[PDB]
Amino acid sequence: AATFHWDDPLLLDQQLADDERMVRDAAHAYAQGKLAPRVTEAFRHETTDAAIFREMGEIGLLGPTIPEQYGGPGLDYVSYGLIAREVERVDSGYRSMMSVQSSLVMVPIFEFGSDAQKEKYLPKLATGEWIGCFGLTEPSMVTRARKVPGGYSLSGSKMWITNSPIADVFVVWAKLDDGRDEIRGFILEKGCKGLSAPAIHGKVGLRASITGEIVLDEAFVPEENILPHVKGLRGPFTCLNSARYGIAWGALGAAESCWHIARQYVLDRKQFGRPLAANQLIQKKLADMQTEITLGLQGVLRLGRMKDEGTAAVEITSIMKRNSCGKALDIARLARDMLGGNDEFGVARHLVNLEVVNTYEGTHDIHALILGRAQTGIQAF
Amino acid sequence: AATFHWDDPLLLDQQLADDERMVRDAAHAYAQGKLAPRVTEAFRHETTDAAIFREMGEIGLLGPTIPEQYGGPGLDYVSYGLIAREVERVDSGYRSMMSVQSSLVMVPIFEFGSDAQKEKYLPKLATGEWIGCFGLTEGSMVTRARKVPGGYSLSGSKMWITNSPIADVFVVWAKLDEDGRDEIRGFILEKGCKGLSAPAIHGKVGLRASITGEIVLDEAFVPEENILPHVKGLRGPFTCLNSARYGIAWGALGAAESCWHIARQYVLDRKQFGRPLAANQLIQKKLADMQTEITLGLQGVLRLGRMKDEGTAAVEITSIMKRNSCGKALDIARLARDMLGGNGISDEFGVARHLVNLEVVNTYEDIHALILGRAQTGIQA
Amino acid sequence: ATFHWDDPLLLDQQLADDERMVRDAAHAYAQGKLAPRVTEAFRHETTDAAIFREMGEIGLLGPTIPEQYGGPGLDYVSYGLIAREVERVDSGYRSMMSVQSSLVMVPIFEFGSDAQKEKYLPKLATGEWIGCFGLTEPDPGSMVTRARKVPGGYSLSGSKMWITNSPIADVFVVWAKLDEDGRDEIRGFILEKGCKGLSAPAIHGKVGLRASITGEIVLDEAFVPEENILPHVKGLRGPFTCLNSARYGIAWGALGAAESCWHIARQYVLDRKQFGRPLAANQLIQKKLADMQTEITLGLQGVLRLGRMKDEGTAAVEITSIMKRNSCGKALDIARLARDMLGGNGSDEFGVARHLVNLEVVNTYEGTHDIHALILGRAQTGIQAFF
Amino acid sequence: ATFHWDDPLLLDQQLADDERMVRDAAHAYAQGKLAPRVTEAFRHETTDAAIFREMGEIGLLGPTIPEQYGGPGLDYVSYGLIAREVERVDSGYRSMMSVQSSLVMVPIFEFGSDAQKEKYLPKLATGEWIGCFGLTEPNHGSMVTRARKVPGGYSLSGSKMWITNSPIADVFVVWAKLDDEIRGFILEKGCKGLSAPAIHGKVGLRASITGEIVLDEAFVPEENILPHVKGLRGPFTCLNSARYGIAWGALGAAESCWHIARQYVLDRKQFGRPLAANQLIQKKLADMQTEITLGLQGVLRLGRMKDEGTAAVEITSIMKRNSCGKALDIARLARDMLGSDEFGVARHLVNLEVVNTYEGTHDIHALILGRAQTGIQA
């Protein structure tokens, strides 16, 4: 008769290749060892210790799928997932910091940049010497690029850019007018005249990470700084799609923490002679947590394997990001409502983080509509 | 480059061996061909239909995991599930009939029986020549076996026994006191044997397409050669139930898919405000939830099926999958029912049949939440 | 003061003495005459047309219709109360009644000529004449039933589907488009049983509402004299006023079916044991019982207050959306809750299963759960989201 | 007739003229004085005991207490409308007020001596004296805080936890065992052996100052024990009265979330139109509207029943449980709609998460109600 691992019912551990398991082990060791002791004060006062980029770099956690050639650790998509799951187990803020370097900065430069851009930027982003941000979202994009001698002059604002006040490297999307008017990507650097990055304070969720603007006022960008190999929606969206995948895995790490913190709490606490764990209702909730996490992980894992094999279409990412974020939130709320205080209150932190996460990279509802269109051939917006 | 399959987002078809695809397609052809034309009649009138057993036996779908040595098709657990899903895709009542034969009759005989019992019973059960049934419901059981000359005499009633009013072979579990210990033992019986009655139950709300009844034991004589020698206690009926719940977890997903596909076609065909129903955001969200929940549920039963084939699967996992599958199928059936208008005459009101079937299935035994609550906490409620 | 678990807010004390007496008479009739019928009627899909006369005699047909025309001249609160008592037994019987009242008597009274009113209403009040309402076709703006002017009146061709009472109806109120002067508008026409070109075949093998006979209305150039056209309404206003009336009684009725499933569930857990303990003492069971009580209790406050506002003419049509959506949704959740609490498979308790399939149709008829959400959303925002 | 999206059942029209005045009085104060404070007060867990002064001035404290003792002599419906308007701004503010009214003034008025009543009620009423209520103990009816008879007459030892208002209280209503039964004792700021230190770093209710009560053989003069209550009836009476106020207040918080969510979807655009054009959005809006609309009928009728004398205690269980659960769901719906003023919702949300869980995580009101239906305890 087989052992039952309640904490891994389907033995995900045995579904992994050994280098994958050991990437997971390293990320785990790092987050629990270096981020967990930081998290309570950092979230409380809204502090980001940028040395974190430098830290994840040293052990090869920045841009996991980027080839060794360009300074990356040359890992697969399953490994990218496991890393994100381990970092978010501690805090979603720290997962975002990492999501931005990997998917929103390193990925566009690798996929759409020339050989010189890749050689100049990727090695230093891989180590965390250089910190990246990604400028898409604005306060139908308005930000413009006008051809000038030597390159391009950019004007417009981006808003809600994580990493931007501390960023070395900016991947900015703007419309460039041929007679056709299309979306292009540009690489900018800290120090470029016309480039501002004011910080943003007061966030309710993701408070462990720092966010800001990118303000452009005729910021000169040379010819060698336009991403040569992409035009239109493809650029920004390939980035978002990569990020959603890590977010799919990450939210599940958050969900596991809440689940474990709830589980221990009811083992520990008592009402009317018995530990809370004796309660029938309590056991249904714990069974719900375990079930949804268990299925979610098979979901993201399978997506990882398909992405690795090139058989994964983009709508699968809607399923998993929507599912992980939605279920993680449900689990955080269940866990929250199981607590009677006003320490094990890390749960309250995970909860407000997940409230934000479920709102970014596409709402729960817009992902539903993506699946609805793919099922019906009818757009509902 | 990779195409999306709304009907199989994760490409489960590609996660199978061509072997298991052919087993799946064979069961599909049978069920759509032979069972589907019957079902509305059989459900509405709670008809007694037995020719299904030969039909599935001929094509080697009865007792899939029983070796060829005893007339079985020697298949694995993954293939069992695929067959069960395909039968339930038509009706849970038919899947039920088939579940008794394979899991609750051929399985205990094969596992706990003597060689002679195995060659007497299994090959006739395998072809459907003999219809089996399973007497458990009435650890604290009241049905009793007494030591007598040349064997045992049995007394008691078994309630809600599917296939019983038409069975040729009865696997009855009764308590036997001997030497001081009062353990649980299993017994084989045959049709038309003195002291044995199998009267029917009519007027069921669900599972109507399947004949159910009682087993009535009035000091019924059983030879020594008919007591299952290799099991006493819990492990006897538990083994069978575990096997059945594996099949059920797979089967409920089939019924869930029927409701989903029916609801999807219906909202594409039906128009309101000059516009297909499928154009509505509210409709699309529902279709996204159905697709999500089935897709994850199918990865769940796939993994478990692979884990059983490698002896890596603890019994608690089965509780996860059976609970999830049945739960989610019912929600989906309710979602689909609530999406339809009109009342009973169209094909789409196959949803209503599936619905009441699943209401029975979901409450037949929250036994599984508790099993899992205890597996996590150690504490029983 | 003590607790009434069955009536926490003592709704019984919020009623007027006449309203209370009207309720007890509806209770006495439903329990005495309808309860003994319902199990076989539902199982065999039989409707005893004699029910309509029984209902007529005691003033349950067109409760709000004036005594001039045979109605008992009662207030809206009393109408609701009547619908709750009938639906306590079966939604199929409440259906029969709400059709006669809101979908037949109401439109003739409100829109008809003096001549039509006196010709039709008294016999619909006694139940001598059975009515049915022809709007739904195989939303009303996309209607294809067509009336065309001929010498002496109109010719009607089209098809109506899922029409309760139609196979046994003496009176048919049929909605059809008529191009006239400038505009193609919706008109209501009265038809009698026997009329040439008019057929009402029954529909058989329903999943829900099996206790009420339902059918079609098939018009094949059926002649309608000028005297049979509702003179005093055009367009959506016609069908809608009737539906608003029907939804009000449906919103009260559904709480009746909810109450039955609640009472049945509670008695069951009082009787059954599990692991040596009465099912009643389980915590989760008590949570479900508390949810049922709460939703019913609040749902009743809602429909009563709606009842009051209508009687004093302060109620807008949107408040009917709230209470129809709420009563039906909550009643369905409660029916599902009760069903999931029982083991077995088909007895007295599987009266719940009857109430359940009934409520599944009810939730789906006279505007879906979602359609009423969208009426409410539009009223809150000024932006229509229907299409 | 005209439809009122924001008051579909015309609750205005169900209230007496003086009841509508008291509501608006509380509304005016809340929006005028409390709303401009709340963001900073909440964010930095600062409380301004001036609120007691301002509420006492306009008679919002102990609203059901007779004019004879300095209260406004109002009815239960009025208390409810007051709770609702304060919580509309913040659950923390409502909490401080609800302690003053239901957990201090009510037991003194109900169980006290005429002299205790004359000393404390008037100063509590004006908010010159700030009160608090000592029942809940660190780990725990069967409490451990005990009174033993000394010479005239009592010595109390024990601890009480999560006590709102304590670090700023003038008056302390403590429940202790004495033989063996539960009794209430009045202590005042200054009594030797009595300490009320603050609890900092709360997730929710951050706008109400909270603390503990530590009694180290604190002496209570014999004149200070409540003479007219023994056992469970004492603390329960206070809790039942407070639950009633919370039942109204939770709806006020729910209303703000609904109104904030509504305006947000009206103001914000996506794909060329307002969010409010989305079907998924309108259904949420319709649910919020329905549950609030119904919840209000429920607490209004309960109010009228209290004023009549026709309400058992179990009804308060239905309404508190409903109001808190529904308010919390609505707050979460509202949170999940937002992409700033609007984030008043996140504050209402953390408040409602605390408020819903305050009486244990095992749903005591379901059981009270289940018991009441079956006759069989859980």
Under 8 Å between Cβ of D134 and D174: yes
User: Looking at beta carbons, which residues of chain B come within 8 Å of D278?
Assistant: 281
- C266, exposed or middle or buried, with CB in 10 Å at 0-12, 13-18, 19+? buried
Q: How far is CA C342 from CA A72, B185, B357, C90, C352, in A?
A: 59, 30, 14, 20, 9
CA B140 – CA A195 distance, rounded (Å): 78
Residue D149: how many other CB atoms lie within 10 Å: 11
Beta-strand (E) ranges in chain A? 132-135, 144-148, 151-162, 169-176, 182-189, 195-196, 199-200, 211-222, 270-271, 274-275
Under 8 Å between Cβ of A342 and D354: yes
Smallest Cα distance from C283 to chain A, Å:
8
Joined together, the tokens standing for residue D249 give: 């207040």
CATH, domain range D231-378:
1.20.140.10
Taking CB atoms and an 8 Å limit, are B341 and C363 in contact across chains? no
Smallest Cα distance from A44 to chain D, Å:
10
- A178, exposed or middle or buried, with CB in 10 Å at 0-12, 13-18, 19+? exposed
Pick the CATH number of B132-232 from 3.30.420.40, 3.40.50.980, 3.20.20.70, 2.40.110.10: 2.40.110.10
Report how this structure was experimentally obtained: X-ray
- A331, exposed or middle or buried, with CB in 10 Å at 0-12, 13-18, 19+? buried
Q: DSSP assignment, residue A359?
A: T
Tell me whether residue D280 is annotated as binding.
Answer: no
D113 touches chain C (CB under 8 A): no
User: Looking at beta carbons, which residues of chain D come within 8 Å of A365?
Assistant: 278, 280
CA C350 – CA C198 distance, rounded (Å): 39
Q: Which CATH superfamily is domain B233-381 in?
A: Butyryl-CoA Dehydrogenase, subunit A, domain 3 (1.20.140.10)
Stretch (H or E) spanning D162: strand D153-164
| Closest partner CB to C3 (pick from D14, D289, D314) | D314
CA A58 – CA B212 distance, rounded (Å): 67
Contacts of B31 (CB under 8 A, 6+ apart): B86, B87, B89, B90, B94
Coil vs helix vs strand at B128: coil
The upper half-sphere exposure of residue D150, i.e. CA atoms within 13 Å in the direction of its Cβ, equals 11
Alpha helices in chain C (DSSP H): 17-29, 35-44, 51-57, 76-89, 91-98, 106-111, 114-125, 237-271, 283-311, 317-341, 351-362, 369-381
Question: Of the candidates A72, A31, A32, which has an alpha carbon nearest to the alpha carbon of residue A52?
Answer: A31
For residue D211, list its beta bridge partners.
D163, D198
Contacts of D75 (CB under 8 A, 6+ apart): D19, D64, D303, D307
| Angle, alpha carbons C127-C131-C132 (nearest 5°) | 155
Place of tokens 């007779």: D66
CATH topology of domain A232-381: Butyryl-CoA Dehydrogenase, subunit A; domain 3 (1.20.140)
Give the residue numbers of D annotated as catalytic, written as ranges: 359
Question: Of the candidates D66, D86, D70, D73, which has an alpha carbon nearest to the alpha carbon of residue D25?
Answer: D86
CA A248 – CA A327 distance, rounded (Å): 11
Binding site residues of A for Mg(2+), as ranges? Answer: 195
Joined together, the tokens standing for residue A66 give: 């980027």
Task: Name the resolution in angstroms.
Answer: 2.4
B280 touches chain D (CB under 8 A): yes
Residue A193: how many other CB atoms lie within 10 Å: 8
Beta-strand (E) ranges in chain B? 132-135, 144-148, 151-162, 169-178, 181-190, 196-197, 212-223, 271-272, 275-276
| Cis peptide bond N-terminal to D153, omega within 30 | yes
Smallest Cα distance from B281 to chain D, Å:
6
- End-to-end CA separation in angstroms for chain A: 52
| Closest partner CB to A342 (pick from D162, D339, D346) | D162
Check for a shared fold between D1-130 and D131-230. Answer: no
Binding site residues of B for Mg(2+), as ranges? Answer: 196
- B234, exposed or middle or buried, with CB in 10 Å at 0-12, 13-18, 19+? exposed
Contacts of A67 (CB under 8 A, 6+ apart): A74, A110
Question: Of the candidates C90, C86, C123, C87, which has an alpha carbon nearest to the alpha carbon of residue C104?
Answer: C123
Coil vs helix vs strand at A59: coil
CATH, domain range C131-234:
2.40.110.10
Question: Of the candidates C173, C179, C182, which has an alpha carbon nearest to the alpha carbon of residue C229?
Answer: C173
> Chain B to chain D, count of Cβ pairs less than 8 Å apart?
8
Contacts of D143 (CB under 8 A, 6+ apart): D135, D137, D158, D175, D176, D177, D182
Smallest Cα distance from C287 to chain A, Å:
10
Coil vs helix vs strand at B78: helix
List the single residue in C with minimal CA-CA distance to B204: C346
Taking CB atoms and an 8 Å limit, are A281 and C282 in contact across chains? no
The upper half-sphere exposure of residue D365, i.e. CA atoms within 13 Å in the direction of its Cβ, equals 25
| Closest partner CB to C346 (pick from B204, B280, B338) | B204
Residue D377: how many other CB atoms lie within 10 Å: 11
CA B146 – CA B256 distance, rounded (Å): 46
B291 touches chain A (CB under 8 A): yes
Beta-strand (E) ranges in B163-308? 169-178, 181-190, 196-197, 212-223, 271-272, 275-276
Residue A262 C-alpha from the chain's centroid: 25
**Would you say domain D131-230 falls under CATH 1.10.3720.10?**
no
Q: How far is CA D355 from CA C96, C105, D49, D360, in A?
A: 47, 51, 21, 10
Contacts of A191 (CB under 8 A, 6+ apart): none
CA A181 – CA A231 distance, rounded (Å): 10
Sign of CA dihedral D201, D205, D208, D213: negative
Under 8 Å between Cβ of A371 and B291: yes
Under 8 Å between Cβ of D69 and D123: no
Domain locations along chain A: 1-131, 132-231, 232-381
Stretch (H or E) spanning D365: helix D364-374
Residue B379: how many other CB atoms lie within 10 Å: 17
C383 touches chain A (CB under 8 A): no
CA B86 – CA B81 distance, rounded (Å): 9
Contacts of D117 (CB under 8 A, 6+ apart): D69, D108, D109
For residue A200, list its beta bridge partners.
A211
Read off the amino acid at residue D300: L
Joined together, the tokens standing for residue D206 give: 């951050």
CA B363 – CA B248 distance, rounded (Å): 13
Joined together, the tokens standing for residue A124 give: 């230093």
For domain A132-231, the CATH architecture is Beta Barrel (2.40)
Taking CB atoms and an 8 Å limit, are C283 and A281 in contact across chains? yes
Q: How far is CA C198 from CA A381, B292, C162, C217, in A?
A: 45, 49, 16, 7
Residue D268: how many other CB atoms lie within 10 Å: 14
- D48, exposed or middle or buried, with CB in 10 Å at 0-12, 13-18, 19+? middle
Contacts of A143 (CB under 8 A, 6+ apart): A135, A154, A155, A156, A157, A158, A172, A173, A174, A175, A216
Q: Which of residues 305-324 of D touch C (CB under 8 A)?
A: 305, 309-315, 318, 321-322
Residue A125 C-alpha from the chain's centroid: 16
- End-to-end CA separation in angstroms for chain D: 48
Instruction: Give the dihedral of Cα atoms A36, A37, A43, A45; nearest 10 deg.
Output: -170
Stretch (H or E) spanning B352: helix B350-363
Under 8 Å between Cβ of C82 and C26: yes
User: Looking at beta carbons, which residues of chain C come within 8 Å of B340?
Assistant: 364
CATH, domain range B1-131:
1.10.540.10
Q: How far is CA B316 from CA A65, D231, D250, in A?
A: 36, 48, 42
The upper half-sphere exposure of residue A42, i.e. CA atoms within 13 Å in the direction of its Cβ, equals 22
Per-position DSSP letters for C185-253, written without gaps between them: EEEEEEEETT-TTEE-PBP---SS-TTS-EEEEEEEEEEEEGGGB-TT--STHHHHHHHHHHHHHHHHH
CATH topology of domain C1-130: Butyryl-Coa Dehydrogenase, subunit A; domain 1 (1.10.540)
Pick the CATH number of C235-387 from 2.60.40.1220, 1.10.10.10, 1.20.140.10, 3.40.50.2300: 1.20.140.10
CA C39 – CA C355 distance, rounded (Å): 11
Question: Of the candidates C114, C155, C111, which has an alpha carbon nearest to the alpha carbon of residue C133?
Answer: C111
